[model samples]
Target: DTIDSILNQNKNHSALTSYVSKKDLKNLEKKLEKNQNIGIRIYGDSHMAADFFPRVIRGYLIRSNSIGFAYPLQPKYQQNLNLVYSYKNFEILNSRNPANAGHNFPLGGIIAKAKTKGAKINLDTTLDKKNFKIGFLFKAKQNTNAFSIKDAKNQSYELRTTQINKWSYKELELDLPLQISALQKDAELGGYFITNKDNNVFLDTIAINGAKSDLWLSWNQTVVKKELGLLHNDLIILAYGSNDALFKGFEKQKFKNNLKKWISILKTYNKNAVIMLISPPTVVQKQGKNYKLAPDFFTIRKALYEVAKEEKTLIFDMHQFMQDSGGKNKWIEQKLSLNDVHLTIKGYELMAKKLLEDLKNIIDY
Candidate 1:
């Protein structure tokens, strides 16, 4: 009698379930097919995270987001490395006239030479000519090249922001708009170099904004739905913490907790996104610096791995990748730019190639 009563009241059962129908599976397959792969890299510290911006740009253009638009503007943004002309990769034998010191290193000469040789330069060396502007936000100083730090300093060009002290991150951000405009005016908007001594200037949030985050939000909100554009399912690539490891006494648990929240926010924003958390490349403990593995990396890695497990995301062991890239010092020696920390022009292309190979093994594309 009791069993008969329960069966009669089947509608009152607390547990209800539905199976994935063929239609559901097809929809999922279609969504997966439309996924866009995004790469996010953080350069929180200057000396340790060389090549962060260049590598991020390389990753986006050659590997995943090859749609060919300049990096988007946001509250946190860095200079667009791309130039009106491809300005890097060739040898420039500058013609200097020491006799005429006024025009010895004239910007006009560089412009004329670049045009005459048709060299694909990666930077804007055109001085303040034309309508070019130099990047200023989180900018080190006037005439400073973000990429060639040591080179810039040797010429007494500029130094990183030091007037405001450690708590001046807000001030640094506040100066971005004017800085970027000035930087763009001088050289037709190619990226630049800076030295390693510019401590406070690296790994600003704006750099990551340039990497992908802000643009992702804008495109999703406006272009996708409002413009009737098809959204790409995203495979997010996170390359971070190398710069963070430079600082001491970072609370491990607290940092992991924050990263967990970051992941949650990312998921909320992109309903159909998959995430891949990458560990930072190894750091060489140079000049008694604190560049060893972060005290919280293992903790953060373990927690993020759990997140990946629960969320069904992918993982790429960048720590191992760095080790295989001939260890930490090798990168510093060979691949880093003038600062001996960031990637040289050569390193950017190399990283792109390596990542493309890795993606090929998993993603169908």
Candidate 2:
């Protein structure tokens, strides 16, 4: 009867009752209820880490303070503070006493486009001392304003936790108090995020509770331990694994192993923490006379299910969520994108709706 009930909920879901018993559901319900229910969206593109994706995620979170990205704002440098109204159009003067229009960007057009869809802005730090280094660690984007350096005077309130574009994921070793005080005193930090105007940069791994995403998540925990002065909670939701899906050279077992490591580490840090694996949302690519799902779909999809069962963690099926959202064609039908790959406003709204609705059912909000 439980199997029948689950089957009836969605034919797409073939979860075995044995895999998720009524007992497991009760355990899950209890765990999800205990956590603070902080929503962090990790975003980026292919080749970028799994934590980063959905570049619009930050915009979405800005619009709805109900959401937050795992990516922290840099220690000292807050973002996009230059608001200048001159020359008949609103512009962001990236630097004062502009040289050759290099620092001038059209703020009106950018803000208007985001506002046209109602995306809000969240500065990393205002002049107020509220957003100091004690806040979360930030992920700077290569080739984008996801992280930008304002003048030192502009961002004196915060601190720079790390330098930009200098290290690979493994190389990022930020020990809490070893170099702590040096970070406290505001100094002129330099080096800028690299840019490629023609290509859109993909960013992911902003934050996660567990998995490869957890490395950054681990880094965040260290900050919280030595910095935020907060306690760990149950039900740390890690919304990642998309990059591992699209990677050409990725091995399924290897991916599973990485996720296994992530979960174990998370458990090690907070033994009571419950891990939730978020599967990738549906992706569409046109092939002659057809719109096909991504190539690695079943491999990772099956692996996620297997990992969830094997590791005894909950699985959130983002794949079915997107498919059920007007069945993919709705993405094309509503003209929900400038590119077939990226989600449109309507598409995003559909995703936000389904994700929020689904989580609310299992977890008490």
For all candidates in order, the CA lDDT equals 0.33, 0.37
The best candidate by TM-score is 2
Which digits, one per residue and each the tens of the lDDT, describe model 2 over residues 1-365? 43233234454432221234455456646533443232222322321222122333324322222212122222112222211111111122222112312311111001101111112223322222222122223222232222222232343222333454321111121211111111211111111111112121211132211123222322323323322112232344455555454334467787778778766765566545556666656654557676566677667778888988887776766556545534556446656432334555454444444444454444444
Q: Model 1: what TM-score?
A: 0.42
* Residue 45 C-alpha lDDT in model 2: 30
Q: For residue 135, what is the lDDT in candidate 1?
A: 29
Candidate 1 stretches with Cα past 4 Å from truth are 1-78, 82-233, 285-306, 336-341
Per-candidate TM vs. native?
A: 0.42, 0.48
Instruction: Count clashes in each candidate, considering only residues at least 3 apart in sequence or on different chains.
Output: 47, 22
Candidate 1: lDDT over CA atoms?
A: 0.33
